[PDB]
C-alpha cells in the first residue's frame with residue numbers, strides 16, 4: 001500500500017518530543033484506530049537518524065510478538081515521515097509509575113516476565129533493543145506490556161550499562177542490565193543510578209553504585225543484584241530470570 005495523510009483522521013497528540021509527535025489516528029476506509037508517529041525530515045537529516053528510522057521500520061514490521069508493539073507501514077511527504085503503528089490504549093508504564101508512585105511485587109514480576117519473553121524473542125532473532133525504559137514500554141487493553149521505539153536497536157544514561165556509557169563493545173546483555181534498572185525502578189519509583197547531573201549518573205553507573213530501601217524484598221534484591229553486574233557475561237540469561245524464585249512466586 002502507498003498510503004497518504006489524506007487516508008487518516010488525526011486525533012490528540014499522545015506524546016511529544018524531538019523529531020516529532022505520536023498521534024491517535026483512524027484510517028478512513030476501515031475505521032482502524034492506530035498510533036501515527038509524525039517525524040519531521042528537517043530534524044532527522046540535521047542529526048543523522050535516517051538509519052535508526054529504517055531499523056525501527058525493518059525490525060518492527062518483521063517482529064511479531066504480543067509483547068512487542070506492531071508497525072503496520074510507513075509513508076512520507078515533502079516535510080514529514082509517518083510511521084503507522086499499533087495503538088496501545090493503556091499508555092506508557094512511565095505514566096503508570098508517576099500515578100502509582102511505585103508498583104507492588106506482583107505488577108513488577110508480571111512486567112519483568114512479559115519484558116523477558118519479548119526480549120528472549122528479539123535476542124533469538126539477534127535483535128538488541130538498547131533503549132529499554134518506561135517511556136518505551138506500552139500497555140495493551142488487557143494491561144499487557146509492549147516494547148516500542150526500536151529506533152536505537154541494532155543487531156539520559158539512566159538505563160544504559162557501563163559498556164555503552166564507556167563506548168565499549170556490547171551485545172544482548174545490555175537489555176539484561178536495563179531489565180535490572182527497570183525492576184528496581186518499578187519497586188522503588190526511581191531508577192537505581194539517578195543523580196542530579198549526567199556526570200554524577202555516569203559515575204554511579206560505571207561503578208554500579210546503588211542501594212536498596214528497606215521495603216525491597218530479599219528475592220527482589222537478589223534478582224536486581226544478578227542483573228546489575230558490571231561484567232556483561234556475569235548477567236543471567238532471560239530463561240534464568242523467568243526461572244528466578246521471586247519471579248515464579250509473584251508473577252502472573
Ligand SMILES: CCN(Cc1cc(Nc2nc(C)cn3c(-c4cn[nH]c4)cnc23)sn1)C(C)(C)CO
Nearest residue numbers: 014015022035085086087088089090091095148149
Ligand atoms: C488519555 C488517557 N490514556 C490513554 C493513552 C493511550 C496512549 N497510547 C500511546 N502513548 C504514547 C506516548 C505512545 N504510543 C504508541 C507508540 C510509541 N511508539 N510508537 C508508537 C502507541 N500507543 C501510544 S497515551 N495515553 C491513559 C488512560 C492510558 C493514561 O494516559
